[PDB]
A paper describes a structure:
The macromolecular SMN complex facilitates the formation of Sm-class ribonucleoproteins involved in mRNA processing (UsnRNPs). Here we report on the identification and structural determination of the SMN complex from the lower eukaryote Schizosaccharomyces pombe, consisting of SMN, Gemin2, 6, 7, 8 and Sm proteins. The core of the SMN complex is formed by several copies of SMN tethered through its C-terminal alpha-helices arranged with alternating polarity. This creates a central platform onto which Gemin8 binds and recruits Gemins 6 and 7.
To re-evaluate this interaction, an SpSMN fragment lacking its unstructured middle region (SpSMNΔ36–119) was co-expressed with a fragment of SpG2 lacking the N-terminus (SpG2ΔN80). We could detect clear electron density for SpSMNΔ36–119 but no electron density could be assigned to SpG2ΔN80, suggesting that the latter had dissociated and/or precipitated during crystallization. The structure revealed the SpSMN N-terminal G2 binding domain (residues 10–35) and the C-terminal YG-domain (residues 120–147) encompassing the YG-box and the serine-motif. Two molecules of SpSMNΔ36–119 in the asymmetric unit (termed the glycine–zipper dimeric unit), interact via the YG-box residues of interfacing helices. Interestingly, a closer inspection of the crystallographic packing showed that each glycine–zipper dimeric unit is stacked upon each other in an anti-parallel fashion around a screw axis between S130 and A134, leading to an infinite stacking along the crystallographic A axis. This interface, termed the anti-parallel interface, buries a surface area of 592 Å2 which is similar to the 620 Å2 buried surface area within the glycine–zipper interface. Anti-parallel stacking of glycine–zipper dimeric units is facilitated by the serine-motif where S130 and A134 pack against A134 and S130, respectively, of the interfacing helix of the adjacent dimeric unit, through mainchain atoms. The methyl group of each A134 forms hydrophobic contacts with the W131 sidechain of the interfacing helix. The sidechains of each W131 are stabilized by hydrogen bonding to the interfacing T138 sidechains. Our results thus corroborate the previous notion that the SMN glycine–zipper dimers are the fundamental unit of higher order oligomers and reveal a novel anti-parallel interface between glycine–zipper dimers required for higher order oligomer formation.
Author numbering:
A (entry chain A), B (entry chain B), C (entry chain B), D (entry chain A): 10 to 35, 120 to 147
């Protein structure tokens, strides 16, 4: 009956939210690489400056 | 004339747009400081390692 | 004959040339990582700004 | 006497080292532009990629 369509809709709704949660996961890993990249840029910057004072 | 009183509306309308988005601005500043902090942790870690080698 | 023993000299002479210039090679690798690090800091900074605009 | 020549030589020696210190200054600024250029190449690369995901 019309119950099968409503059940199908909740399924498609579950897949929709499951998809955006993956999208959010991707944005999270992106911002972690952003932070590490700034850490290493500072590290090799400081390291070169330190070797020069030799 | 109208120009004086009209700007007083856009002026007030401006400060109220700021107020409505102070939290979002706070998250933004929080993440800028996060990024600068990790840069600097890296900087001073690399510097110290570079000075030690001499 | 001579070919076998002669190559053993150039072979050993090679590894010892490497040893004599490991520090200079270290400075070189340090500066390659410095360059890649700043590229990546820029990459992820620009990406995040580009995603935010949507 | 021969003291004037030795004094003249130390002067010319001072100018010689003062010149190479400028040369070293030029090599330094060159490597800073090298690093910034890689930063901006990454930045505009990331930024374009970010706008595309729109």
């Amino acid at each position: 009956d019309d119950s099968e369509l409503r059940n199908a809709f909740e399924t498609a709704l579950h897949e929709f939210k499951k998809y955006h949660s993956i999208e959010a996961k991707g944005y999270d890993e992106t911002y972690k690489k952003l932070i590490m990249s700034w850490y290493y840029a500072g590290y090799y910057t400081g390291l070169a400056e330190g070797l020069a004072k030799s």
